[PDB]
A paper describes a structure:
[name] catalyses the synthesis of the low molecular mass thiol glutathione from l-γ-glutamyl-l-cysteine and glycine. The enzyme belongs to the ATP-grasp family, a group of enzymes known to undergo conformational changes upon ligand binding. First glutamylcysteine synthetase is responsible for the ligation of cysteine to glutamate and then [name] (GS) converts the dipeptide to GSH by addition of glycine. The TbGS subunit is composed of two domains, a large “core” domain and a smaller “lid” domain that together form an ATP-grasp fold.
Author numbering:
A (entry chain C): -1 to 127, 134 to 180, 185 to 237, 247 to 413, 417 to 422, 431 to 441, 465 to 535, 544 to 555
B (entry chain D): -1 to 127, 133 to 178, 188 to 234, 246 to 424, 465 to 555
């Protein structure tokens, strides 16, 4: 994984890093330096990650099954409450207050917007060096998933090294190990993430789907009949992007949000939960339906797209929870709904491992057929609290069960897990555009994105009496982070 | 003209400065801070500048005459020398040393690389007052390190964002270039494309003239080490560049599209990195850098100001380049047409424009001659009295830079811009300066290489850029930190 950096130096390029910072700026792969304005480049790898056509294909093909698992589970509210009550009684001020909302909104008789937009990412890591997959699933996340916007840019940056290197080689010369991603045609090709286009369109199509549900034109016509006597309704609704009080990953959200505006013609406005305390008002128009959420007494909110609320600190006040509840209570298709949010919790990525009490019945409704395909990428997990055979699982061979605990420290004795040595390598990486760091024991984490928009279990809502309006692979990103501290963005070159 | 910032405030636009900064970074329209690595958006206007298709037409079509007029005067070495001698006597430590290179390389009978590559930009400004004249007057001719050929087309894309944004905002409550209607259309510059191709073709022309593979072969026959398979564009860069965006915007296309390598060096660097290797004493010597880089083109993004020549080392390096085979952009004789004196001499027609710069084509001279602000000559080699006698009939409209000029009242319009992270409204206080780029590649004055027996390999209009500025503002450009970039929108 140091071949690029080695070829560069040994082909007499000494000023490569300037260039690579310049290409970074062209594509707009950047981040604010701590001192005031003035953005500098993101941390990026000098080489892409290698991946079989087949293995890549498998990960892409399975995202719908993932999304579905999450939808099915998330909408199983009784299950969520029951299957998480102990984590709630433990973390009251966050995990608890989130479980309360599930209840007040979805589990009392109260009405609620049943459409939900998922923009998830499933993160796999490859197994080191059974018909199970080498790529084990290490992380599932449904809330403010990062890089769906930045990710494609990385491929264009890697295309640049490939070009530069081609000309540099020819210039000595020697194309003769070709590491064939450099010579674009066939055997190996840098695969551009489709997520910069698919995710803006999901958001787009969710706003559209909200408009059509509500008959927003008629909502206005009705609205106005009450004012035929203080603040008119906008003529289209908007995406409310909920941001943290200290916002980061900005380039990324713009790359997304700019496409929603320019390509799909829908306004995005940025709010903190705090700010919505005083901006957001619910407005009932039919008692038996979730209220319309106007912001500033004119913004109709079609989608509440969270780029926040995932960690406790974005809830520094009751007001913040008041505002967070207000949206959920509303009619905006949320991303994530609380249900979807609660499916990020590690406690459920564990539960999903139970392939017979949770995976098949709850998250696939008995389609053990489908369930069995996800299974391939599993790492067994095993709880520690009540159920008498939480001792038979501990009495079970050989120092291979997890910073984390493992080996001599774990031995001295939170949840059991099957130990997998993940594939590690050393990698050229470029930080701030001017420090080339040679990282060591660099893992690569491939994250395959999914977009889903679904209705109630059992509705007709989405065609072929589905209830799913759409469910699809949504591109990918790759993060290179050390096993054991900040990742670089990387990208896939697929070989067959 | 006011409209944009009023439409935003009115339509309830919100965080628009940040969105707009976002779009810049995303489009790669940026500028280095004075403090190291960080980059911030360029100053840009929140609306395009308007021009009629017919005037914009004539401006484009004039550019090849401009390139031609510059090519010829430049190549009339003895004329060029005589012209600048008083202006060199006044300033010996810059103009003098430059004029000395002309003397050395081109006049005293050495060999020199005869092929020359011009990346120019004639700027105009519309007067605000019959078609005996154009309404657009030429203000500066630029032949050394012309800026914005790379970034200009991004400015259209930025403005295109604003127009998209304003449609959506208008639509959202009830409800001109904002709409692509077709009777007013934002035209994106082609300078980002035509210029790289120009540098590409220049390398190609050098590669052919030298018959390089033939040359590379000889080298192995005649310590001297393995010489690269292909030459490079050498970009001679200022010691502390901020405008790296423009530079790379162009150069990356040379690499990625035209498969040709660029390398950046200061002069100071080149003094160590660059030696010359004579093959025949009748041809100018090859220039290799770092032992292996063959220099085919010496593009200069530096050298226009004295501050880039701190050391005699630096002038040395500059001569080495000049003496070399490399096609220069500019060559010294091109460089010297940037000077204010040549611009002032190109004014009188019978004496310099027709016989020098167009070789007795009065017709061509008469086209360019439609965009002139008459400059006359006080402190004269002639009697120079019958302009001074003329003036005090109608005395109220002639300034001087030393040299009597005619007093054009240049058009003032209204606009808003985003500079230094603030949104600036300029009410009836903004003048714009339309910059037509041009490229040229030519041989010796009577040679054959080039199209239809002419010494000219190519000569096109190369797109355009627009710069706007407060009218009450202090002298000069975007780099000076007083002007913003801008974009034309063309109206039938
Ligand atoms: N405020 C940031 C937060 C993004 C973030 O770092 N969140 C997590 C998901 S909850 C992520 O996918 N990136 C970090 C990681 O890989 O864990 C944003 O909206 O982009
Ligand atoms: N060294 C910088 C700046 C070169 C420069 O100052 N160019 C001048 C002409 S010599 C220009 O086009 N004017 C800057 C302006 O008008 O704002 C670069 O290569 O971009």
């Amino acid at each position: 994984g140091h071949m690029v950096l080695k070829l560069l130096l040994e082909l007499g390029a000494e000023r490569y890093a300037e260039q690579f910072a310049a290409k970074c700026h062209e594509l707009g792969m950047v981040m604010k330096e701590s001192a005031g304005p003035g953005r500098v480049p993101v941390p990026v790898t000098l080489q892409p990650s290698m991946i079989s056509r087949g293995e890549f294909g498998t990960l892409c093909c399975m995202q719908p099954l993932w999304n579905e698992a999450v939808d099915n589970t998330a909408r199983n509210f009784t299950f969520l409450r029951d299957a998480l009550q102990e984590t709630a009684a433990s973390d009251v001020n966050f995990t608890g207050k989130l479980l309360n909302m599930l209840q007040e909104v979805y589990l009392s008789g109260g009405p609620f917007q049943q459409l939900m937009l998922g923009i998830f990412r499933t993160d796999y890591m490859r197994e080191g060096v059974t018909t199970a997959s080498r790529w084990k699933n290490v992380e599932i996340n449904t809330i403010s998933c990062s890089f769906a916007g930045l990710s494609p840019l990385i491929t264009e940056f890697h295309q640049h090294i490939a070009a530069y290197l081609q000309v540099l080689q020819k210039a000595r010369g020697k194309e003769d190990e070709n590491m064939s991603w450099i010579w674009g045609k066939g055997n190996c090709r840098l695969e551009r993430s489709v997520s910069g286009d698919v995710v803006p369109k999901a958001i787009a199509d969710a706003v559209r789907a909200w408009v059509e549900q509500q008959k927003f034109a008629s909502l206005r016509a009705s609205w106005e009949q009450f004012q035929q006597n203080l603040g008119v309704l906008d003529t289209a609704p908007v995406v409310l992007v909920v941001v943290q009080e200290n916002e980061r990953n900005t380039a990324d959200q713009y790359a997304l949000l700019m496409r929603v505006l320019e390509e799909h013609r829908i306004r995005f406005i940025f709010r903190t939960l705090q700010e919505l305390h005083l901006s957001l008002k619910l407005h009932s128009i039919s008692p038996e339906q979730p209220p319309l959420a106007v912001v500033d007494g004119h913004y109709p909110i079609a989608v509440a797209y969270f780029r926040s609320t995932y960690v406790p600190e974005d809830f520094p006040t009751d007001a913040t929870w008041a505002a967070r509840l207000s949206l959920e209570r509303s009619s905006a298709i949320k991303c994530p709904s609380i249900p979807y949010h609660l499916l990020t919790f590690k406690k459920l990525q564990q539960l999903l491992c139970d392939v017979d009490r949770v995976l098949v019945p709850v998250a696939f409704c008995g389609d053990s057929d489908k369930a069995g395909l996800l299974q391939r990428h599993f790492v067994p997990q095993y709880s520690l609290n009540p159920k008498e055979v939480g001792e038979e699982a501990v009495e079970k061979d050989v120092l291979q069960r997890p910073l984390e605990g493992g080996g001599n420290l774990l031995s001295g004795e939170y949840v059991v897990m099957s130990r997998i040595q993940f594939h590690v390598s050393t990698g050229s990486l470029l930080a701030r555009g001017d420090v080339v760091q040679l990282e060591r024991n660099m893992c690569s984490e491939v994250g395959i994105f999914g977009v889903i928009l679904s209705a109630a279990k059992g509705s007709s809502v989405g065609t072929n009496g589905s209830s799913v309006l759409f469910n699809t692979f949504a591109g990918y990103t790759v993060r290179s982070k050390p096993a054991d501290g900040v990742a670089a963005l990387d990208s896939l070159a697929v070989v067959p």
